[PDB]
Design a protein around this ligand. Sequence first.
Ligand SMILES: Cc1cc2nc3c(=O)[nH]c(=O)nc-3n(C[C@H](O)[C@H](O)[C@H](O)COP(=O)(O)OP(=O)(O)OC[C@H]3O[C@@H](n4cnc5c(N)ncnc54)[C@H](O)[C@@H]3O)c2cc1C
Lengths: 134, 666
Amino acid sequence: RKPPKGMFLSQEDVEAVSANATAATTVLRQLDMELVSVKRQIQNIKQTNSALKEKLDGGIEPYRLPEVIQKCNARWTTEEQLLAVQAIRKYGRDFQAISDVIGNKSVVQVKNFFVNYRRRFNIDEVLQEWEAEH
Amino acid sequence: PSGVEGAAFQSRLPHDRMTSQEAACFPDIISGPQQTQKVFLFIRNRTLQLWLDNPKIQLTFEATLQQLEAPYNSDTVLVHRVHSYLERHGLINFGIYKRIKPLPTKKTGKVIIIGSGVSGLAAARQLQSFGMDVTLLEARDRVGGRVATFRKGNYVADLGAMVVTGLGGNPMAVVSKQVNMELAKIKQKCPLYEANGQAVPKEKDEMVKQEFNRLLEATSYLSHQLDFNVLNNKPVSLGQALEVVIQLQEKHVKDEQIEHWKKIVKTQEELKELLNKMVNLKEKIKELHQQYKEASEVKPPRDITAEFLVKSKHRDLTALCKEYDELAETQGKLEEKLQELEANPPSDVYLSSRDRQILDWHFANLEFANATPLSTLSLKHWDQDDDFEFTGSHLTVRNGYSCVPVALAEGLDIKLNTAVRQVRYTASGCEVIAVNTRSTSQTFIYKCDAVLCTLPLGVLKQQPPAVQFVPPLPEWKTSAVQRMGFGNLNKVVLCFDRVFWDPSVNLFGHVGSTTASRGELFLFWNLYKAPILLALVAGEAAGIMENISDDVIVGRCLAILKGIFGSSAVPQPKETVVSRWRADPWARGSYSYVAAGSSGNDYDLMAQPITPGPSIPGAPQPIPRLFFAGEHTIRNYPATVHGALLSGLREAGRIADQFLGAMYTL
Ligand SMILES: Cc1cc2nc3c(=O)[nH]c(=O)nc-3n(C[C@H](O)[C@H](O)[C@H](O)COP(=O)(O)OP(=O)(O)OC[C@H]3O[C@@H](n4cnc5c(N)ncnc54)[C@H](O)[C@@H]3O)c2cc1C
């Protein structure tokens, strides 16, 4: 059935350690070298990643923008309509990005915007200019 | 075990089933109906019980039939056959018992027994008990052979057999009641003392110990489950199979270290790609913040495109600051998952060089027990006799084992100082040519109907031979002599003026420096009333220590004992003795073992008696003339006294069946 618990002895392994006089000392020396190879290969990436860690020093704190905390409004000020069109030009269909730009429009209000104004700002035409810019 | 069934067990017989031997003598019964068999079995068991409950007096057929009840005592030929069978084969009325009916006036048949070892002496007493002319020839000046006992003053120390290996089923239990035997038990606890002379800590002991026993089980797994029993056309030894198992453990230790570090790197290399991604996002962020700064430097009022640019770049920046925050999330998980892996390293080593020496002691003990280097023991068969092992604590003979063979020798014609030089056996009879050990020219001739050869296997092995067989022993017998192992182990007796060891401790070990010298003085017994420390030499060491003077050897014993007990707690020894069993010519070693390429089946060959060719050609098949007993002939109890004793009983029964006939068959 099975060997003592913690003792390992595969059929395959026995054959491999008995196949000659020093198949014993061969296979165990391969592993002594296999280990030292992986051991230094560790300290290489340990050193490598130690540098890339220091290049991220400071984090991104000097590059972080404070909080814009405004309430999603109903009306489309002509300002807001124009911000929209240009956003559509740059972002295409990323309604979330477009919502974020305009600042006070829920993501549906943005989708809702597409359909009704589509005629008047040729939104079709605008996204043909997108995709062509990719 | 309770009742009649306890006597069956105590006689090494299954209470509820008829044996192969019993079927041979009682085929009518065993071929017959189930009822009759239970009758038989009970009669047998009861008759045994009776003998056992009082083994200091002959049990007669009358005495037996007397105590039997109905329905069992109805059939008296059945009860007579049973009592006769038992009596014959030494299951009852063996050893030293008081005869009711003094010996038959005259004798039938003449048998020469070579050697007064416990085998010989046991056989002799049985054959004389069966009215035959029995004469034993011993080369030594003393009986017992490999049951030696050193005596001087009040000091008494066995140089040969010492231990009764449990009384449960042991026929020496019966002899121990027939002779006064101061049988002291053995508390098994044995503390080990490394070369420095300081006990291995309890914790350590148990790892190595348990690992040892785990390694043995491992070899059995190799043998039976993986069928690893041949290698390069040579049979595998236990020694080899341990190295293989050990190497495979050392290999596995490394295999795991490899995959643990190989896991670290795969994580480390995920982190490398994450740090790169993060350094390049910090770059785009830095540049993109500058742009949004520049876009807000444009003071209003501004048209809607330059308003859009600020909003655009503001969105685009918080978008990239989302990512980088979600990558510093990921970074923190992988960074601790490394302190995880680098805190749980698998075992540094399989066994350290310190532990490996202690394990070597546990192997030397095994080499002591089997009386041979582990490289010689058969892997498949070394432990074959493990099932027939007796129950109960092991014991010593405190008054000296030689008390037993001496006791057996009483009332026997024994020719001491008589070295058998040649055994001739022919259709018509045997002549045995011996000499006097002292003046070797003075010759003796002995005519007899049959020879019983208890010559030790080491002697049977000698080349050129110490004894000549005429005609030569057949190919099949001489091969089995090559094949089987004869081992060796020596004892050193140290007699002191006072006890300087822990006297609640029977035995304690010493751990050697090397593998090479693991058996050298590796163990000491305090088992005696007096102040005597007995010191053991086993394994490969035993054979080499025979070429070293007693003084030197005593040197190394004291040296060790100083280490353990203090450099001025150990006096000089008053009296010292050193065995050399392999050198001793009437032994040529200690006792048998199952050598690689032998099996149990060779022990049965050793027992098989020899039948000579016919005198006149085309005349009928002769009788068997030359018989064999001894420790090396009993498959299930080799290398013991009880084994020898039992072999003796066996051959006596066989010889008697031959030359006195067997009235008990029907
Ligand atoms: C060191 C040691 C410790 C042991 N410890 C134990 C133990 O603890 N427990 C246990 O149960 N068993 C033990 N044994 C085993 C036991 O001692 C033997 O197995 C047993 O006594 C053998 O009896 P035997 O008759 O087969 O051979 P032996 O006892 O050797 O008897 C054979 C006789 O033949 C004689 N002989 C040899 N050559 C010639 C010749 N050419 N002519 C005439 N005679 C000859 C010998 O001198 C000897 O008396 C031990 C053996 C040894 C060596």
